[PDB]
């Protein structure tokens, strides 16, 4: 989801039990109002966004990525807010081989302190 | 006449089922209430130039 953010409202309670957030997101051709819950609230707070700084957000990932300020410098982004695409990933066979070897085997991609991977994994 | 009245009652029961299912879909189960009687912070980002 990418567009020119217009309004951001955050309603967090001090010594309370809940928080809330309301956003106004608008493109050149349409606008819609949405209300946030918990994950996107903390993602927005941790990555500082104002009325002038424009963003991309994924539903499943939940990650909030800066797309450059429109002002305060680019024109208003066009097109529908929703965008479905595909992202490709290339992983060499050795890295799948090692990633499943041990619970700490992922670090061997960097430190390399692995070896003698059991033949029952290959 | 009694059968016409029964038909009317059947039709209004059917529309009652319709209205009940639409109301069930539109009612939601929101139990958040994130206001409380306690201090709470608000931040607003917008544009103001008159």
């Amino acid at each position: 989801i990418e567009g020119e953010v217009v309004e951001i409202q955050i309603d967090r309670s001090i010594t309370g039990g809940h928080k809330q957030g309301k956003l106004t997101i608008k493109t050149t051709d349409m606008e819609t109002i949405y209300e946030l819950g918990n994950k996107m609230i903390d993602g927005l707070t941790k990555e500082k966004v104002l009325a002038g700084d424009v963003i991309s957000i994924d539903k499943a990932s939940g990650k909030i990525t800066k797309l450059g300020r429109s002002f305060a410098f680019v024109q208003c982004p066009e097109g529908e807010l929703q965008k479905r695409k595909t992202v490709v990933h290339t992983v060499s066979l050795h890295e799948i081989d090692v990633i499943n070897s041990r619970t700490q085997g992922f670090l061997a991609l960097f430190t390399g302190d692995t070896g003698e991977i059991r033949s029952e994994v290959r | 006449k009694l059968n016409i009245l029964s038909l009317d009652k059947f039709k209004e029961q059917e529309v009652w089922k319709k209205e009940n299912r639409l109301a069930l879909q539109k009612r939601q189960k929101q139990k958040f209430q994130p206001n409380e009687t306690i201090l709470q912070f608000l931040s607003t980002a917008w544009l103001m130039t008159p």
């Binding site: 009325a51 410098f73 | 009687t37 608000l42 931040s43």
Partner: peptide, 15 residues
């Protein structure tokens, strides 16, 4: 129109 250092209201809630 992007004037000033991005005014951000700091509001309190509730009375």
């Amino acid at each position: 129109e992007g004037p000033e250092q991005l005014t951000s209201r700091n509001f309190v809630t509730l009375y």
